[PDB]
Amino acid sequence: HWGYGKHNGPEHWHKDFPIAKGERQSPVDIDTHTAKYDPSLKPLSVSYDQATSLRILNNGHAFNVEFDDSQDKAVLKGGPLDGTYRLIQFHFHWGSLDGQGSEHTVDKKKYAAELHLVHWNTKYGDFGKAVQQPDGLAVLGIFLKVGSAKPGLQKVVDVLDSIKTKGKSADFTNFDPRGLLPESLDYWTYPGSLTTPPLLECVTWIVLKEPISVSSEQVLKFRKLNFNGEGEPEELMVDNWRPAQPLKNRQIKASFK
Ligand SMILES: NS(=O)(=O)c1ccc(-c2cnc(C(=O)N3CCOCC3)o2)s1
Ligand SMILES: [Zn+2]
User: Fold this and answer.
1) Catalytic residue list contains 7
2) Is the peptide bond before 27 cis (omega within 30 degrees of 0)?
3) What ranges do the domains of the chain cover?
4) Of 124, 144, 196, 248, which is most buried by a Cβ count within 10 Å?
5) Is the CB of 65 under 6 A from ligand 1?
6) Peptide bond preceding 233: is omega within 30 degrees of 0, i.e. cis?
7) What's the CA-to-centroid distance between 39 and ligand 1, angstroms?
8) What is the CATH number of domain 1-257?
9) Minimum-distance ligand 1 atom for the alpha carbon of 196
10) How far apart, in Å, are the Cα atoms of 245 and each of 7, 29, 87?
């Protein structure tokens, strides 16, 4: 019953999920002047060359491109992380308009969308166990702005017709997530949470400073998705983002001077 409407949206989540008001909630505003460069942060290691995508799913909140995470095939390492985190899925959050849509903000600036590459700590055996741990997940966040098209996003865009409504899925093999990365891997990092219910406080957030550009046509196709199931009243899947939450007792660290 939670969602993003006037009656079930982020302001309501705390009633079913009291951790919504917790001590390490995401997303947050990234105050670029207050984030501290941390020279002890390792370079980030993104190893996606062996990635195996399987499926794309409209889950009624966003769409997930899911990966085979039954072996170490696509991993995130280094940066603030100890150990090996395996890619399980990626998805996006986006707006009804180019001026909003991202979950994280940068000096209060909202981007048109935000990509989340979700990884789980292999020390915990599977995703389900990992989300119960303070260091269970690493989500790589990448901002999208509207400008030139992102060629590597287009295979995703073109399959969206086939998963228009909640619960629809489609085969989605041989998609290469390296096509969605910016040039630079400079990042901010802080400890936080899933940004949707159950809002578990299990994520090390790694948010890239460099946005990717997508075209107006690409983002328009995101906005044609539906929150509803087939044969239900059409509600466009837009504004599926949670706003910035209080930073509280946390420091955001920068990987770069
Ligand atoms: N916006 S976010 O913070 O990146 C995020 C919010 C919720 C996520 C979630 C929950 N379950 C999964 C998942 O991929 N699985 C694993 C178990 O639940 C169903 C499928 O992802 S990922
Ligand atoms: Zn997300």
Assistant:
1) no
2) yes
3) 1-257
4) 144
5) no
6) no
7) 31
8) 3.10.200.10
9) 6
10) 19, 8, 26
